Amino acid sequence: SDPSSINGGIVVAMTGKDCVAIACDLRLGSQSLGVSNKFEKIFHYGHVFLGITGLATDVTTLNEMFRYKTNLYKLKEERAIEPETFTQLVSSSLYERRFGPYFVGPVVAGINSKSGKPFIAGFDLIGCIDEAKDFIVSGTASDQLFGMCESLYEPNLEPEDLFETISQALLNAADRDALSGWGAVVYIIKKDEVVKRYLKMRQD
Amino acid sequence: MTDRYSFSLTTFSPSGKLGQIDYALTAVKQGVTSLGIKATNGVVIATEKKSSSPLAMSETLSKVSLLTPDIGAVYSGMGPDYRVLVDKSRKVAHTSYKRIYGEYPPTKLLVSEVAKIMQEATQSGGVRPFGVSLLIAGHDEFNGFSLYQVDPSGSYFPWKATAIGKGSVAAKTFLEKRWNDELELEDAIHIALLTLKESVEGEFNGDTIELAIIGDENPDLLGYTGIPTDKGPRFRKLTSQEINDRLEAL
Amino acid sequence: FRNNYDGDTVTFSPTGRLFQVEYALEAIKQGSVTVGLRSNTHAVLVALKRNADELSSYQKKIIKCDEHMGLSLAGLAPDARVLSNYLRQQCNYSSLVFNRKLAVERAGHLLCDKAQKNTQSYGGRPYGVGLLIIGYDKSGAHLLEFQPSGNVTELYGTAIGARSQGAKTYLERTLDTFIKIDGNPDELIKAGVEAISQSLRDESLTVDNLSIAIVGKDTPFTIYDGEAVAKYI
Amino acid sequence: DRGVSTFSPEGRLFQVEYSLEAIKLGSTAIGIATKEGVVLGVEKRATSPLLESDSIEKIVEIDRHIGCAMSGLTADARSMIEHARTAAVTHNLYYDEDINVESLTQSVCDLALRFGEGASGEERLMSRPFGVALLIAGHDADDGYQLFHAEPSGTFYRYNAKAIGSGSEGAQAELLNEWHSSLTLKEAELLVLKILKQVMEEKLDENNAQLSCITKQDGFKIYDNEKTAELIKELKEKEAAES
Amino acid sequence: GSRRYDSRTTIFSPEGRLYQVEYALESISHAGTAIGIMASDGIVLAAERKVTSTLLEQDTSTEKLYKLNDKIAVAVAGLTADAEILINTARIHAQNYLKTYNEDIPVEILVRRLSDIKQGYTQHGGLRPFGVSFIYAGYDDRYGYQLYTSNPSGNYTGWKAISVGANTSAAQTLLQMDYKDDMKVDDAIELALKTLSKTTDSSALTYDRLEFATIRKGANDGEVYQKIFKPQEIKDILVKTGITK
Amino acid sequence: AGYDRHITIFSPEGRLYQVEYAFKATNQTNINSLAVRGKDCTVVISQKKVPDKLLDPTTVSYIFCISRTIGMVVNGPIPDARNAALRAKAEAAEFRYKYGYDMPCDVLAKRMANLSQIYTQRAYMRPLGVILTFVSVDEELGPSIYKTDPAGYYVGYKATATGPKQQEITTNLENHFKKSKIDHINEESWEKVVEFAITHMIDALGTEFSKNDLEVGVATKDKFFTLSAENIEERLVAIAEQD
Amino acid sequence: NKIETLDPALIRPGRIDRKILFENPDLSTKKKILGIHTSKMNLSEDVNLETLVTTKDDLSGADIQAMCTEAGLLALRERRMQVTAEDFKQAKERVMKNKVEENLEGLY
Amino acid sequence: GTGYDLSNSVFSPDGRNFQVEYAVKAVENGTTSIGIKCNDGVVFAVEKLITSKLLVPQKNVKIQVVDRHIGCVYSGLIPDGRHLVNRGREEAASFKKLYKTPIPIPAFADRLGQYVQAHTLYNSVRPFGVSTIFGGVDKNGAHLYMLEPSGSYWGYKGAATGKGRQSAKAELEKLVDHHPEGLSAREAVKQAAKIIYLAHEDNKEKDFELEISWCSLSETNGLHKFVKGDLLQEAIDFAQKEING
Amino acid sequence: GYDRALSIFSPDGHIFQVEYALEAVKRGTCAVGVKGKNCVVLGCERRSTLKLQDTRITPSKVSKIDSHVVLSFSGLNADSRILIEKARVEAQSHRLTLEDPVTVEYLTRYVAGVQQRYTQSGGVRPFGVSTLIAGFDPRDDEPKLYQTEPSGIYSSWSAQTIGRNSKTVREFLEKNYDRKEPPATVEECVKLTVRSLLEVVQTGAKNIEITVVKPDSDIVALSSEEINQYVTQIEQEKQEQQ
């Protein structure tokens, strides 16, 4: 099927009240054979995270291409960047070569440093634009999370209530899929500091 | 087969500066007089339009163009040297963060990329520099408004109130005399008229004096009634009658 | 200040010519003395080439092309080891692609503009090499005198070199007799031998330094050297 | 000055006519091709009493059955290593035999002289046509031993006995009566060293000169310092027996 | 034409050297004075400005002195526009290093690489180099702090106290006898302010003509901290150092 | 050194010597013309000189048809006149290829000026000092005239001319444009407008001409044509009946 | 200063043969230049004249002529024939900081 | 020096550089070649100066006829005249490739003027120093255009070059009053030998040879013919019939 | 780009490019070296007087090609490092092809081979770089010394040195130092080297740097303390009148 789906794993992201919840798993491997228990999909530069889902050729290697233009933005502007602004560089990079495009849909989640409005972003492997006020996910198991937060998430929830919603939905979504599992790390995006909390799930 | 001349421009004279740049300021002193000021309530870009024939209509001539809706620009000296820059700037800005990001880079680093090409014209073999100096204002994100002067070398000049062109030394001191914490939009117009117009002579009308304001957004300039995520094209230019109306206020 | 109208290739002289060609015309006299003509059915090329030492031998200017054609160049040959070899490639290129006899018109037409491109396009020197090319076709033998100025013409015979004007003018009276006599190539070669005696007012006739070429209908192109010219000395 | 395309009043290039001055500034060498073998030799002289003549090569080898030498700057001597040596192997790559010395010289001269102001297809970027006088000698499978030379002007001529270098004016004058058709290999070994004695400004030494030969069987063979010193002692014994 | 007006200034001149390098020193002499100082707790970097007026606005304040990395800075002496080409060019080569080994690059790698850029113009291409001199300041886990200074000719030498611009030999003389192996941030600034007062013809020293950005070791933590001081903070430096004018 | 007679560098006077010689004499052709604008149309008149009996009058023209709605007025050297004409006609078709509308005056005049301004950057390639005037009738804005100067100067012109007498006709037209306070001619019937422009032309000259001695054309709405020999002669005869 | 371009329009081969160029003095030459200037000069017996000779940059007899006069006028203000040590280094700086300037060419 | 002789990329006060003026003297020093434009077609003329008996008549032809429907002839320098022939005949082959139609005379004239104007813009490109005379028959009618070495070309009912260019055209105006449209062009062929004979008075040195290559609107209708046999000697004897001595 | 040539051939053989390429060494610092039995010693100096830097933080003449081959020379700075990186890639090119380390003989040819295209082909000007090349051969302890001229001329040497007044300094080693009888102990090559270094730089031993090339991938850089040990021995028997 998808060559980038040989590894597996997904990145879940949501939007709360003055808070943003985003999480992924630690699973990395080839087909049904896992390799890395320490692998982390979420990357962070600035005030906004970056999730990535797909083949490590387009995950870890292209990560130097993201920070290539990001650091140039940092060494020149010497300021922050809105999630909508950095998302255009993502989409434009995929449509430069239509025959050779990269197969990793990123996930972008952060809180505005100017107006203070939480916003989430990130696209699929082709670069199709999907932006909502609830949740934006990607990957093969992202089909599950489309209906999970519909019966779970509620408008204007506290960061602690939002933490329990994204955690419980991600742990059960990984047990149902062979491409996700082996621990789940959750990051709580606030205006300034970010809190990291490790979680325990079903091993096998 | 074209461009067989690989040699650079005039080398170092027994001076310490470049002779191509020194003679470039001659056209600036013999060119139109331009100025600019940042009042934080608005940015007024005013200049003069030289008409040497009565049959020449100044409606076609626009010395202040729009690269981006929040950034105004004005030049001095040779007219067509700026026209080619506009054609090049809009193409380079198209390959700039306009395509990369959802917004163009701020005036500070956007002009530096454009002015970098002007310095490349002073170096690479077979190209020749210009004789013009550009005053480029603009509106940034965090820093609000901005004003910058551009020599033919292309070094950015973060000024507040400056003036170039013919009689720039006499017109620059007048801008240094009138200053305070924060000015206004209309005050910058009246100060420019008491400076630009009274410095030169022979053109008393508004067709030969081009003035534009920045920071005023009219609802008719958006073109759509949809959700206004952004204010709009803060750049605004007075018409032929509105410029003469500013003269009756002094 | 002659550096302006001479050293520059693209400049024009007040007379309407290029002074670089004037020096190329002098290179003909500075080189070896050659004699050639066209008798139609038979053709004779007698080229005398001096050496640099008594123990030294000259280098061959004549380059063989095909059986029915040949070429003998006069003056010097700085670029001829390339051009004439490239022309020799065009000799077989016309035969193996266009199947052409390669007459004296197109053979001198391309070379006329080829040396002009050096003056037209900056970045190269003019060739300035005299070429005498003869060829045979259904219309008979034809001679091509190629000057550094791109001269395209046809002569019954010509002699260019140092003090070679004596052999050029003196043979004009008997020129009609030489062309009307065919079938005896020996007497036609001996006609060029008398031209060598008229062209040398200092030394005598050599043996190894003498080069004689011949081409015709049944007889292919060949170069006479050593014992081959013993009967013509 | 002005454009390189400027000719002489006789229609020749300046760099070609002026290429003879760089040859006199080099080393004096006289090649000779006899009925038995082909005598090769050069002059190392000395630039200092501490100079070592072991690692310096003023006589190269293009192929086994042929030989080469140099008089001039050593820069252009390596240009034929990628050209003349390549063309000799290219001949073995196609026709797999020994290339004729008559054809090899003209084939090298095609790769030897290429220059000008500029050209797209061919490389004219070379400024000076030649800074060195290269000798071309060997054995032909048909005719026999042939002694040729690569001139700094780019042309080529058949040389029974050739003398190059600064002393080529006085050496070649007497070389006319010295060279004969009956000259053998052994008779030509003491003849070259006798001529170089009047040329060389210092005492004849194994480190001040280098000689070699071209054999139709063993091929190009250099003379070792122990063997070169033997020819030096034979010269001193021969000159004393002339009177 | 295309020849007589081409004197080939990039090749060997009859003086035995390059005119483009010699005459560029005068352009450096007219350039602002930038005195780098490498102290024990950091690297002190100061610079001047061109024609400071009353209405001249200082916000970014970086003209002849930039910052390549949090651990690595850069300073230029010459025409600002000529340097701006190689200011972000070294960063591109630096970001390519991040793409390569994914770590921090030592300064010594990018010193010689940029030297061949201007030298390549004289070597071939028929172009001309830049008359701007470069000053490199960076950090290392082996050599500790690193302060280097380049020149348009391509020379690079380590300097703990370096001075360029006008009065090059005059400013380095006062810093040579006043040098000390142990100097803190406050000790190196007081020695630089007294030197810059004698470099120009102006009256004493003010905060408007002083371009100053330095680096220290840590701020809240103990490593990896650098900040470009705003001109409002530069005025407070004169009060802390005890030197008003 | 310092002279612009070959290369192009900035003079100490702040003005290029090439720009001088381009602006100095554009009258070396020794010809005059005029351009005016009507209400819905545009009338242009150019003098014509035929100094031979063998010249075909239909071949010689200073007004070339660019687009269907676009005329052109050119004064200068004949070989360099068609250099901008063949380029403008090639660039006029590029507008439909990129867009598929009719070339507006604000584009064709800008493209040729920007192309001429590049010649200021290029020192090797020669610019053109030929007078370029692009006349046409726009649909929305009506008549428009933009004169492209060799230095890149182009702006709105209500009227323009050539030769040293350009300022003489300007004086007569300025008084008529000052009282009426209109840039163009509000009078209809372009047939009588052609005779109106000839009256101002006679004052500068003072003589009459024949049908083939005057190049006259009229730019109408969505059409541009060239008056034939019979159409020109009819107006020169009819003007005498009125005044 | 530099007769290079000037030279072979005049000198000719053998009418005038001389070439003399300014040479950087060594440790021995600098002692004879500075030591003999002090033959008639008087100064503090506790100061050595060879102290500044070890490390110095291109100071010829012309540079010393001012360092003797500049340091002399400062001591003469107090009407004393001897010059102190502070005037020795003070006179060397202003001479080295004015006429003496290198090309900033290192290594090579 | 003045710059006009070395460089054609500068501007002359008279509009024509001295380098272009030198091309006029090169054309006037060649052989006189006239042209005929009448109602029945377009007739050319060419002469070959005989330097010696070694030259062979009826061999060298300076008239270059593009296909059968367009003739052309040059003067002055041989290579500069034949350089345009290869380009003129190449564009005619490219014309029939795209449009599959014969090329008219006015479409043929613009391709020639474009090469002259482009070579005068580049200083490194040597311009054309020869004059071009071309004509023929197209779907419309007879047209004759002469390309000057400066590049200016327009409608011509007659052509001349070499010695007495404006003097040879004086006989062409005499036929205008006699024949308004030119009428029969066959008699003009005999008049062509008489016009060339007018230049033989001052220029007489050695034997002369005349060649005529023409094209007609009526007889040929676009084809190509050549004057030979009785028509060759009939026109020559007509020029000598007026003046026998 | 540039189609023409940046050099012009001389009528008498006196070439402007050859002129000032040799004086570039005369303007720069001297590079002193001497061969030996099992090793080779290469000394140097520094033009700068006031030294605020360290020998390790700022490299000057220190460059390496093979593991046991250390190549030190002074013709220039920027143009000198260009030929070094090309030689290191060429040294790897033999490891990518021949799999064996290249001899010093070709290492001199490659440096002059790039300089060959400069003097011959146009579009690029030659350098003033003159390299003194040293080092060993695989499984060979015998050193080599080759003086590379900017015109592409090289020769074998022993005590040869290039720099300021190096022709006179070399004359001191033309007699006392015997090429036929090279010294044995490694420190014996330093005793004759330090005596030759005091004829140019004289005082300011901080500028004096000595790099000893040893086999089995070993490089010893002498300090200022070990150099002063041989300075005292110079004035012992020289000042005494016999």
Domain architecture of chain A: domains with CATH: 1-204 (3.60.20.10)
Amino acid residing at I140: D
**Of the candidates A128, A154, A156, the residue with the CA atom closest to the CA atom of residue A142:** A128
As a whole number of angstroms, the distance between CA D116 and CA E80 comes to: 41
Please give the full DSSP string across chain H, using - where no structure is assigned. --STTT-SSS--TTSS-HHHHHHHHHHHTS----EEE-SSEEEE-EEEE--STTB-SSS---B--BTTTEEEEE-S-HHHHHHHHHHHHHHHHHHHHHT-SPPPHHHHHHHHHHHHHHHTTBTTB----S-EEEEEE-SS-EEEEEE-TTS---B-SEE--STTHHHHTHHHHHHHHH-SS---SHHHHHHHHHHHHHHTTTS-SS-EEEE--EEETTTTSS------THHHHHHHHHHHHH---
**Contact assessment for residue F140 and residue F101, using Cβ atoms and an 8 Å cutoff:** no
Question: For chain I, where are the E strands, in sequence order?
Answer: 31-34, 40-44, 132-133, 146-148, 154-156, 209-214, 218-222
I77 Cβ under 8 Å from any chain G Cβ: yes
As a whole number of angstroms, the distance between CA B124 and CA B127 comes to: 6
- The alpha carbon of residue E4 is apart from the nearest alpha carbon of chain F, in Å, by 9
Q: Give kind and range of the element (H or E) at residue C125.
A: none
**Contact assessment for residue E54 and residue B162, using Cβ atoms and an 8 Å cutoff:** no
Q: How many domains does chain C have?
A: 1
Question: For chain B, where are the E strands, in sequence order?
Answer: 34-38, 43-48, 56-57, 66-68, 71-74, 134-139, 145-150, 156-157, 161-164, 209-214, 236-237
HSE-up (13 A, CA, CB side) for residue B206: 15
The dotted CATH code for I1-240 is: 3.60.20.10
Nearest CA in chain G to I58: G107
The position carrying tokens 């007044």 is I165
HSE-up (13 A, CA, CB side) for residue H141: 6
CA dihedral in degrees (C201, C206, C211, C213; nearest 10)?
Answer: 80
C1 Cβ under 8 Å from any chain B Cβ: no
Residues 6+ positions from F40 with CB-CB distance below 8 Å: F137, F142, F143, F188, F220, F221
Sheet of strand F33-37: strand arrangement: F160-161, F33-37, F42-47, F214-220, F223-226
As a whole number of angstroms, the distance between CA I80 and CA D215 comes to: 44
As a whole number of angstroms, the distance between CA F107 and CA B87 comes to: 12
**Of the candidates H150, B80, B73, the residue with the CA atom closest to the CA atom of residue F112:** B80
As a whole number of angstroms, the distance between CA A180 and CA H14 comes to: 84
* Contacting residues of I for G55, CB less than 8 Å apart: 49, 203-204
Nearest CA in chain E to G103: E22
- The alpha carbon of residue B12 is apart from the nearest alpha carbon of chain I, in Å, by 20
Instruction: Point out which residues pair with H35 in neighbouring strands.
Output: H44, H159
As a whole number of angstroms, the distance between CA B222 and CA B216 comes to: 12
Experimental method: cryo-EM
**Contact assessment for residue F129 and residue H11, using Cβ atoms and an 8 Å cutoff:** yes
* Pairing, β H214-216 against β G82-83: unpaired
A116 SS3 class: coil
* Pairing, β G42-43 against β G82-83: parallel
**How buried is residue C213: exposed, middle or buried, by Cβ count under 10 Å (0-12/13-18/19+)?**
buried
As a whole number of angstroms, the distance between CA A162 and CA A173 comes to: 17
Give the residue numbers of H marked as catalytic. 31
**Of the candidates B139, B138, B162, B140, the residue with the CA atom closest to the CA atom of residue B151:** B162
**How buried is residue A6: exposed, middle or buried, by Cβ count under 10 Å (0-12/13-18/19+)?**
middle
As a whole number of angstroms, the distance between CA F105 and CA I29 comes to: 68
H helices of A77-196, in order, are 83-95, 142-148, 159-176
I211 SS3 class: strand
When scoring H9, H115, H119, H124 by the number of chain B Cβ atoms within 10 A, the one with the most, hence best to mutate, is H124
Q: How many domains does chain F have?
A: 1
Domains of chain D: 1-242 (3.60.20.10)
* Chain centroid offset of residue I135 CA: 11
The domain in which residue C133 lies consists of 3-233
Domains of chain E: 1-244 (3.60.20.10)
As a whole number of angstroms, the distance between CA D123 and CA C82 comes to: 13
Instruction: Point out which residues pair with A119 in neighbouring strands.
Output: A110
The position carrying tokens 């660019």 is F66
HSE-up (13 A, CA, CB side) for residue F206: 2
Produce one character per residue of A184-193: b if its CB has 16 or more CB atoms within 10 Å, e if not: bbbbbbeeee
- The alpha carbon of residue B101 is apart from the nearest alpha carbon of chain A, in Å, by 5
As a whole number of angstroms, the distance between CA B144 and CA B163 comes to: 21
**Contact assessment for residue F121 and residue B117, using Cβ atoms and an 8 Å cutoff:** no
CA dihedral in degrees (I154, I158, I162, I167; nearest 10)?
Answer: -110
D121 Cβ under 8 Å from any chain I Cβ: no
Touch criterion met for F and I (3+ Cβ pairs within 8 Å): no
**How buried is residue C112: exposed, middle or buried, by Cβ count under 10 Å (0-12/13-18/19+)?**
buried
Instruction: Give pairs for B244-249: CB < 8 Å, separation 24+.
Output: B244/B205, B244/B206, B246/B189, B246/B190, B246/B193, B246/B206, B246/B211, B247/B193, B247/B197, B247/B206, B249/B190
As a whole number of angstroms, the distance between CA C116 and CA C139 comes to: 30
DSSP 8-class letter at G16: S
**Contact assessment for residue H23 and residue C16, using Cβ atoms and an 8 Å cutoff:** yes
CATH number of the CATH domain containing F199:
3.60.20.10
As a whole number of angstroms, the distance between CA H221 and CA D192 comes to: 83
* Contacting residues of I for D127, CB less than 8 Å apart: 5, 7-9, 120-122
The domain in which residue B193 lies consists of 1-249
**Contact assessment for residue E99 and residue E76, using Cβ atoms and an 8 Å cutoff:** no
Do the chains contact at A75 and E67, CB–CB below 8 Å?
Answer: yes
As a whole number of angstroms, the distance between CA E61 and CA E228 comes to: 9
**Contact assessment for residue D6 and residue C6, using Cβ atoms and an 8 Å cutoff:** yes
CATH number of the CATH domain containing B103:
3.60.20.10
Phi, psi of D150 (to 5 degrees): -95, 110
**Contact assessment for residue D176 and residue D145, using Cβ atoms and an 8 Å cutoff:** no
H helices of A30-110, in order, are 56-59, 63-76, 83-95
**Contact assessment for residue I102 and residue I66, using Cβ atoms and an 8 Å cutoff:** yes
In chain A, what is the greatest distance between 2 CA atoms, to the nearest angstrom? 47
As a whole number of angstroms, the distance between CA C83 and CA C101 comes to: 19
As a whole number of angstroms, the distance between CA E160 and CA E180 comes to: 10
Instruction: Point out which residues pair with I133 in neighbouring strands.
Output: I146
As a whole number of angstroms, the distance between CA F92 and CA F108 comes to: 7
Phi, psi of E138 (to 5 degrees): -155, 180
**The token pair that represents A201 in the structure block:** 């799930």
User: What SS3 string covers C135-176?
Assistant: EEECCEEEEEEECCCCCCCCECEEEECCCCHHHHHHCCCCHH
As a whole number of angstroms, the distance between CA I157 and CA A71 comes to: 53
Domain boundaries, chain I: 1-240
**Contact assessment for residue F63 and residue F75, using Cβ atoms and an 8 Å cutoff:** no
Mutual orientation of helices F105-121 and F78-98 as an angle, nearest 10°? 120
Amino acid residing at G99: K
The position carrying tokens 């030659």 is I126
Do the chains contact at H25 and C16, CB–CB below 8 Å?
Answer: yes
Picking from F3, F24, F56, the nearest residue to H157 by CB comes out as: F56
The domain in which residue F164 lies consists of 2-242
G72 SS3 class: helix
Do the chains contact at H82 and C5, CB–CB below 8 Å?
Answer: no
Nearest CA in chain G to I26: G108
**Contact assessment for residue I42 and residue I33, using Cβ atoms and an 8 Å cutoff:** yes
Residues 6+ positions from F27 with CB-CB distance below 8 Å: F75, F162, F163, F164
DSSP 8-class letter at E216: E
The position carrying tokens 């290469």 is I42
Q: Give kind and range of the element (H or E) at residue A10.
A: none
As a whole number of angstroms, the distance between CA A27 and CA A37 comes to: 6
D237 SS3 class: helix
The answer to whether domain H2-244 has CATH 3.60.20.10 is: yes
H helices of chain F, in order, are 17-24, 78-98, 105-121, 166-180, 190-205, 229-242
**The token pair that represents A68 in the structure block:** 């290539």
**The token pair that represents F157 in the structure block:** 């012109």
**The token pair that represents F102 in the structure block:** 């009719």
Other Cβ atoms closer than 10 A to H244? 5
Do the chains contact at I1 and B6, CB–CB below 8 Å?
Answer: yes
Instruction: Point out which residues pair with D220 in neighbouring strands.
Output: D214
**Contact assessment for residue F35 and residue F159, using Cβ atoms and an 8 Å cutoff:** yes
The position carrying tokens 């003329």 is H45
Resolution reading in Å: 6.3
Nearest CA in chain F to H9: F126
Amino acid residing at D182: S
- The alpha carbon of residue F54 is apart from the nearest alpha carbon of chain H, in Å, by 5
As a whole number of angstroms, the distance between CA E150 and CA E130 comes to: 12
**Contact assessment for residue H27 and residue H76, using Cβ atoms and an 8 Å cutoff:** yes
Q: Give kind and range of the element (H or E) at residue B227.
A: none
**Contact assessment for residue G66 and residue G93, using Cβ atoms and an 8 Å cutoff:** no
Amino acid residing at A129: I
Residues 6+ positions from G86 with CB-CB distance below 8 Å: none
Amino acid residing at I153: I
**Contact assessment for residue B32 and residue B63, using Cβ atoms and an 8 Å cutoff:** yes
**Of the candidates I215, I227, I210, the residue with the CA atom closest to the CA atom of residue I38:** I215
**Of the candidates C190, C180, C199, C198, the residue with the CA atom closest to the CA atom of residue C224:** C190
- Cα of first residue to Cα of last residue in chain D, in angstroms, is 57
H59 Cβ under 8 Å from any chain C Cβ: yes
Please give the full DSSP string across C180-203, using - where no structure is assigned. H--S-HHHHHHHHHHHHHHH-SSS
